[PDB]
Amino acid sequence: MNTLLKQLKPYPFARLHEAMQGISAPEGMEAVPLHIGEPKHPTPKVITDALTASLHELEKYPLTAGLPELRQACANWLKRRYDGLTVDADNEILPVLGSREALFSFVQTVLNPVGIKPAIVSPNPFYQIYEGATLLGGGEIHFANCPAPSFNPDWRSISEEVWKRTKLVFVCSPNNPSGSVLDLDGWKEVFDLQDKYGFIIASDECYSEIYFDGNKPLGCLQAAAQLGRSRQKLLMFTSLSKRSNVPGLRSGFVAGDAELLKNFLLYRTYHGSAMSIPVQRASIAAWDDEQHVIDNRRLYQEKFERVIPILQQVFDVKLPDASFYIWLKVPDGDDLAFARNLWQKAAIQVLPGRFLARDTEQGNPGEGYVRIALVADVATCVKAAEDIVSLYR
Amino acid sequence: GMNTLLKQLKPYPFARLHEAMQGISAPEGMEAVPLHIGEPKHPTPKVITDALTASLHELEKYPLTAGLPELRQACANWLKRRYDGLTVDADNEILPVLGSREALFSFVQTVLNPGIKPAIVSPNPFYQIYEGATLLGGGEIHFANCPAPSFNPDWRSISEEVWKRTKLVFVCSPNNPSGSVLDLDGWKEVFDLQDKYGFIIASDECYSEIYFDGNKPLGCLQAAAQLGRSRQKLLMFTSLSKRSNVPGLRSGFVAGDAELLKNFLLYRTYHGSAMSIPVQRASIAAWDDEQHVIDNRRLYQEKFERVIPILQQVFDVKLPDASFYIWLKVPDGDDLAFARNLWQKAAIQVLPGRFLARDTEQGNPGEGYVRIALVADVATCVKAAEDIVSLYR
Ligand SMILES: [Ca+2]
């Protein structure tokens, strides 16, 4: 049982808590939680109205594939969002109970060791789920480092021997933590590798709606369409969590290769991941409405518009491609000391970049950075930015 | 391999009735009577929907996988009320789960870690998930047949060779389809086998609240207490789906061995099975209230009170121990021909017992029975019973 469970590594939050033990913030000073990776904006009424109005439907077991009208709301949203992209609600979309369970379960189906040990390639810095899902599925995790200035994945670091047994590659776009959006050239590179080696691509696009000034992030399926490529062995994973301020609703979808999804659905019927009908109705309301999403982007953009210039007094920093993070370069390279000093002097919590990345033969690509989330209100973000500058100017 | 197994598995027996009716039509102008499906049809109570609506602002937050202290305590409090003072620690012996299906499936995956092929033992007739979870986890499924008149599992049909490789045993009590509640002698037997061979016991108790005349079914944890035994390697799985007519809520809990649950919780943080806070609130309301459960139980009591004596005019049948099923012995032994005749003559849908069982060295213990679910209203059930009897006069 505990053989694979024993290989799991502590979560970033836990590493930060341990690192801060014995370091005291100023007496009476409220902690400023910039280290978190979750939204703080309130849930929109359009979603909660739809949930409440359908609660009688709790009396019914939902089918794993979901209501036709939920799959169609996702197909309609895809068309609006990705400039006419046509994805078949009947064959290319499954609702998921948040992207976390979907990513984990899909990986379990992809990894079936017997035998050559199968590999999965993740960006580095990574999202902890990519590693854990791989370890618990009996796979071997490998890391494509994402160095500045583009923070795109360096696939060349991965040997031919590893590529030959690689069953899946993760892309996170927009990236947590770097904000980077993989562009057409980056997608073409990974598609060329896929033609060579035959792995599945899983693209985690949960930050697709968090962007600035009309500069919409390119998605995987859109990139494929722009390059005239089929959806074979391509899957996008997305969520209402960041888009719609409903991390608690546990609702998203997976879309792409109909052949992959046909078999994933069969598995999911046993894995027990069918969506509550009232949750489906709330989700339809969410995917159908853009006003709450527009309002959401406006809140984030206002924060960056104030915070970036404040931080530029002292730091080498610019607006990220997308997402609500700043991946801040630490001037002397010591992300741990940076976090300690901010906590001791201002009760400000930031996440050391090295806790989001693994050591490699080429170093740890999270060292020298901290992750800051602009999820609190603008006054809180501005005060923090000013306090940080005051400590480093 | 994965895909061929998924193509083979049939997660929903009720669907197999259709192929078996092939080209037999029900009479013109007769509404089909669905007694073949193992799912409730009573409405969701207001006490639950009220609590859900009241807490919808909490969709803005990510829930922790372990759940709110107050949900685990509501479960602990319910257990104490239900099992005559049973004391189970909310801090370490209870995890909330998103319906028992995902819980049973994921727990099995963690137990199976395959050169010696691990075994799991299931009752026969069985519940679909037991077979799927085992096979998808790389385990070998073995069957303890449940023959009349007790329908308790016959453990001695499992060889010592299999027992030595057995990692988990399922108990379903009250049983689907037989209604049988494993008693103190039956629990003692499986406990003694556990002491000998060291497997984990997983007890599926989702029908615990559907019973008659004040005769509350014994549960696994209560049986251990009564026999002076610890909870080591014991886990009960339960759900609000049947108790509270909220199968769509996707809510239950698992309780028992704290060490098992510690490891299960770690896995579940990656597996992505944390409960929406508003669903947790609705669930607290559900576990805290008994009036809606008393009302629900009274609906089923009325149905059985009227149906059993009608059927007894022609069939060898009695009130089951619990559950909403009648496991009806077919006079001539041909359960397929029985279901076909009821459909062709009366539009009545019952489930051939062979569809819930696998064949063994001791025959298919589903053959010669049909499962009838009393989930439709009393008037419909009574008329169905009368119509069945007149066809078998
Ligand atoms: Ca697998």
Q: How many Å apart are CA A18 and CA A51, to the nearest integer?
A: 40
- CB contact B111 to A (< 8 Å): yes
Same-domain status, A10 and A90:
no
Q: How many Å apart are CA B73 and CA B90, to the nearest integer?
A: 5
For residue A350, the 8-state DSSP code is: -
Q: How many CA atoms lie within 13 A of A271 on its CB side?
A: 29
- CB contact A7 to B (< 8 Å): no
Q: How many Å apart are CA B362 and CA B148, to the nearest integer?
A: 13
Question: Parallel, antiparallel, or unpaired: how do β-strands A166-172 and A200-204 relate?
Answer: parallel
Burial of residue A232 (CB within 10 Å: 0-12, 13-18, 19+) is: middle
Phi, psi dihedrals of residue B171, rounded to the nearest 5°? -120, 135
Angle of helix B378-391 relative to helix B291-311, nearest 10 degrees, comes to 20
Q: How many Å apart are CA A387 and CA A310, to the nearest integer?
A: 10
- End-to-end CA distance of chain A, in Å? 52
**Which residues in chain A are contacts of B10 at CB distance < 8 A?**
none
Query: Which residue among A60, A241, A270 places its CB closest to the CB of B247?
Result: A60
Same-domain status, B390 and B252:
no
Tokens 């999965």 belong to A120
Q: How many Å apart are CA A163 and CA A196, to the nearest integer?
A: 9
Whether the bond into B177 is cis, omega within 30 of 0: yes
- Using an 8 Å Cβ cutoff, are A203 and A173 in contact? yes
Determine the residue of chain B that is closest to A136 in CA distance. B267
Cα separations in angstroms, B250 against B22, B152, B297 = 34, 29, 20
For residue B211, the 8-state DSSP code is: -
Domain boundary among A255, A288, A321: A288
- Count structural domains, chain A: 2
Cα of B11 to nearest chain A Cα, Å: 7
Cα of B62 to nearest chain A Cα, Å: 5
Same-domain status, B203 and B297:
no
Calculate ∠ Cα A315-A316-A317, nearest 5°: 95
Please tell me the distance between residue A194's alpha carbon and the centre of ligand 1 in angstroms: 21
Q: Residue B345 — left, alpha, or beta (φ > 0 → left; ψ -120 to 50 → alpha)?
A: alpha
Instruction: Show which of residues 38-57 on chain B sit within 8 Å of chain A, judged by CB atoms.
Output: 39-44, 48-49, 52-53, 56-57
Residue ranges with CB less than 5 Å from ion ligand 1: A 108, 111-112
Q: How many Å apart are CA B67 and CA B65, to the nearest integer?
A: 5
- Using an 8 Å Cβ cutoff, are B371 and B327 in contact? yes
Same-domain status, A209 and A228:
yes
Q: What is the largest CA-CA distance in chain A?
A: 61
Select from A9, A55, A127, A130 the residue whose CB has the most chain B CBs within 10 Å, as the one to mutate to test that interface.
Answer: A55
Domain boundary among A288, A322, A337: A288
Q: How many Å apart are CA A163 and CA A171, to the nearest integer?
A: 16
Please tell me the distance between residue B145's alpha carbon and the centre of ligand 1 in angstroms: 30
Q: How many CA atoms lie within 13 A of A123 on its CB side?
A: 29
Contacts of A325 (CB under 8 A, 6+ apart): A37, A176, A177, A178, A179, A371, A372, A373, A374
Q: How many Å apart are CA B44 and CA B292, to the nearest integer?
A: 9
Tokens representing B183?
Answer: 């008693």
Same-domain status, B71 and B57:
yes
Query: Which residue among A129, A132, A278 places its CB closest to the CB of B248?
Result: A278
Cα of A333 to nearest chain B Cα, Å: 31
Same-domain status, B367 and B311:
yes
Strands (DSSP E) contained in chain A are: 32-33, 93-96, 119-124, 140-145, 166-172, 200-204, 234-239, 252-256, 325-329, 348-349, 351-352, 369-373
- Using an 8 Å Cβ cutoff, are A303 and A374 in contact? yes
Same-domain status, B32 and B153:
no
Same-domain status, A65 and A9:
no
Strands (DSSP E) contained in chain B are: 33-34, 94-97, 119-124, 140-145, 166-172, 200-204, 234-239, 252-256, 325-329, 348-349, 351-352, 369-373
CB contact under 8 A, A270 and B105: yes
Question: Parallel, antiparallel, or unpaired: how do β-strands A252-256 and A93-96 relate?
Answer: antiparallel
Cα of B91 to nearest chain A Cα, Å: 20
Question: Which has the closest alpha carbon to A175: A113, A245, A122?
Answer: A122
Q: Which amino acid is at A286?
A: A
Q: How many Å apart are CA A73 and CA A220, to the nearest integer?
A: 19
Residue-wise DSSP of A285-309 = HHHH--HHHHHHHHHHHHHHHHHHH
Same-domain status, A374 and A384:
yes
Task: Residue A55: give its domain's CATH number.
Answer: 3.40.640.10
Question: Parallel, antiparallel, or unpaired: how do β-strands A166-172 and B351-352 relate?
Answer: unpaired
CB contact under 8 A, A2 and B98: no
Calculate ∠ Cα B379-B384-B386, nearest 5°: 95
Q: What is the largest CA-CA distance in chain B?
A: 61
Same-domain status, A110 and A158:
yes
CB contact under 8 A, B111 and A1: yes
Question: Which has the closest alpha carbon to B94: B232, B200, B236, B199?
Answer: B236
- Using an 8 Å Cβ cutoff, are B236 and B220 in contact? yes
Tokens representing B66?
Answer: 């372990």
CB contact under 8 A, B136 and A245: no
Same-domain status, A12 and A48:
no
- Using an 8 Å Cβ cutoff, are A207 and A174 in contact? yes
Contacts of A357 (CB under 8 A, 6+ apart): A124, A125, A126, A143, A364, A365, A366, A367
Q: How many Å apart are CA A141 and CA A162, to the nearest integer?
A: 10
Task: Residue B331: give its domain's CATH number.
Answer: 3.90.1150.10
Q: How many Å apart are CA B123 and CA B202, to the nearest integer?
A: 12
Q: How many helices (H) and strands (E) does chain A have?
A: 14, 12
- End-to-end CA distance of chain B, in Å? 50
Instruction: Show which of residues 140-169 on chain A sit within 8 Å of chain B, judged by CB atoms.
Output: none
Please tell me the distance between residue A152's alpha carbon and the centre of ligand 1 in angstroms: 29
Q: Show me where chain B is broken: residue before each gap, C-N > 2.5 A.
A: 114
Question: Which has the closest alpha carbon to A338: A307, A376, A369?
Answer: A369
Domain boundary among A288, A308, A332: A288
- Using an 8 Å Cβ cutoff, are A78 and A255 in contact? yes
Question: Which has the closest alpha carbon to A155: A198, A208, A191?
Answer: A191
Same-domain status, B130 and B10:
no
Angle of helix B13-20 relative to helix B335-346, nearest 10 degrees, comes to 70
Range of the domain at A348: 2-42+289-393
**Which residues in chain A are contacts of B98 at CB distance < 8 A?**
97, 272
Cα of A315 to nearest chain B Cα, Å: 32
Q: Which amino acid is at A155?
A: W
Burial of residue B333 (CB within 10 Å: 0-12, 13-18, 19+) is: exposed
Determine the residue of chain A that is closest to B251 in CA distance. A276
